[PDB]
């Protein structure tokens, strides 16, 4: 028997957006993150909360300390900035798509920093609000981030979907198409 | 372009084999660059680049701090693992396979990522292209195994006996 | 539902 595993405590603070994140992952899937503003623990799968708790307030303090380190860092490079990195976007089903069978469509945004993006689901060229899921910025082995968007869908020959992904490195919103 | 500022830190608990061999690795990135590491196999902070030298100097001169990080292999890593060992480590999600006309094998909705896929009588050791392993993001994997000749078997930690076609 | 442990972030400066 061998149990090779990796747990990660991933946290960041981003300026000037003033956004922060604190999450855990196991082998590359998120176990939970902390809603900074609400100060609570959001478990990635519902079933998890029955095996484990976490004290959110600790994450908040961590973020605040990160924020203060950032200020220390800026001053050490002399406010010297860096170039943006553009998202690779990809769209795909969660299972084999079957006409008249409920399914989930996945927008996979990859290899991008900073960890801020505008992302919109388009059904037949028009913005979608219902049945959309968002996933905090997830860690990678490197210094880049990845993210998953999920929209519920019903397979149809008529419908045609797009993922519109806006990022600072891109010259303009890259959209990605998906028809049955 | 638009100027930004990131303080990014990852605290990685590496288990080579459950609690038998545990490595703590704390990594500091400023912007797009990793500047500082603490590696429990080393016991100290090491700058990755000039931008991290002052943190390593500040921190390695705090002896009780180095003493605390070393113990974190036990106080955090080992501790957290004994909990995750109840539900995450033994998580078993059985795969569903579907074959459609190159020949298409569909393996989906499974966890963990460890999977064996192969294809009359003898599996073709040639002419195979795959999507690799695909991470859904909701704690399930899916992958496509294709044969280009004008039955597939699947082995996986959730199944005592292989699944065929 | 055991509590999970974490690292406190360190002070730079």
């Amino acid at each position, epitope marked *: 028997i061998k149990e090779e595993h990796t747990i990660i405590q991933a946290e960041f603070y981003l300026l000037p957006d003033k956004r922060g994140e604190f999450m855990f992952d196991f082998d590359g899937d998120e176990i939970f993150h902390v809603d900074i503003e609400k100060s609570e623990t959001i478990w990635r799968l519902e079933e998890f909360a029955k095996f484990a708790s976490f004290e959110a307030q600790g994450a908040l303090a961590n973020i*605040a300390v990160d924020k203060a380190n950032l200020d220390v860092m800026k001053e050490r490079s002399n406010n010297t900035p860096d170039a943006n990195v553009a998202p690779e976007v990809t769209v795909l089903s969660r299972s084999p798509v079957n006409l008249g069978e409920p399914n989930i469509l996945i927008c996979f945004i990859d290899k991008f920093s900073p960890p801020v993006v505008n992302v919109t689901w388009l059904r037949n060229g028009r913005p979608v609000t219902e049945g959309v899921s968002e996933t905090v910025f997830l860690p990678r082995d490197d210094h880049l981030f990845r993210k998953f968007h999920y929209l519920t869908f019903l397979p149809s020959t008529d419908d045609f979907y797009d993922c519109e992904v806006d990022h600072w490195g891109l010259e303009e919103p890259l959209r990605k198409h998906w028809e049955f | 372009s638009r100027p930004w500022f990131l303080e990014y830190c990852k605290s990685e608990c590496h288990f080579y084999n459950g609690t038998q061999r545990v490595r703590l690795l704390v990594r500091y990135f400023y912007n797009l660059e990793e500047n500082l590491r603490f590696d429990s196999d080393v016991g100290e902070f090491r700058a990755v680049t000039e931008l991290g030298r002052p943190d390593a100097e500040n921190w390695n001169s705090q002896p009780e701090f180095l003493e*605390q990080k070393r113990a974190e292999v036990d*106080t955090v890593c080992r501790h957290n693992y004994e909990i995750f060992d109840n539900f995450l480590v033994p998580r078993r999600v059985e795969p569903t396979v579907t074959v459609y006309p190159l020949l298409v094998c569909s393996v989906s909705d499974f966890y963990p990522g460890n999977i064996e896929v192969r294809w009359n009588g003898k599996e073709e050791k040639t002419g195979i292209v795959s999507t690799g392993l695909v991470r859904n993001g909701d704690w399930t994997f899916q992958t496509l195994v294709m044969l280009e000749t004008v039955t597939c078997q699947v082995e996986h930690p959730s199944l005592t006996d292989p699944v065929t076609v | 539902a055991d509590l999970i442990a974490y*690292l*406190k972030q360190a002070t730079k*400066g």
Partner: T-cell receptor
Amino acid sequence: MKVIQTPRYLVKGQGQKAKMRCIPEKGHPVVFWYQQNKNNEFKFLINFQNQEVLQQIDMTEKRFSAECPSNSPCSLEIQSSEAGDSALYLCASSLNWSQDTQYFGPGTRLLVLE
Amino acid sequence: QVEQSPSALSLHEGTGSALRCNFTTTMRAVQWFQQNSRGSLINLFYLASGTKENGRLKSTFNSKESYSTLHIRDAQLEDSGTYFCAALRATGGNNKLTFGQGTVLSVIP
């Protein structure tokens, strides 16, 4: 340099403000306040890193006011003293948020009379 | 939660004994303090593992077995006072030390 706390003792009547002064060791960003009672029980009140408050309990946000302005001494002040506030108030400084070692001031013994 | 014993101890000059702190969860490290007659807390020890020796005192901490001990040897009058251990649990959201119940140590002249 040891931690400094004044005043050593402090008597006040219900309704008054009680104000305590602490000077952390030179070069310690993190600062804590506790109450200790006569049965030797300790209660944590508030957390600071540098000028900024990180953590504090419900009571303190409601009845207390505290500051650690840069290069000046730290202070804690009860807004409207009650008899239940009688306690030894203790200040401690650490060098680093991520590391537990704490050094304590001599305290302020506060007594609140009617 | 931190159970500390014994509650009280009287020691003849030049004799010794030990204090103990058992933790109900994983602690990050442990500290021991003496509160003297003026009520000032003196740092006796910080440790995150192993055993440390300082003068007439020695201390062991074990995170996994979850206890800490404090040894006082060859007691002197100046040792009288109230002794505390103090730990932060690695799961605790608030960065604050939790204290043992304390041992009141009396050295008999």
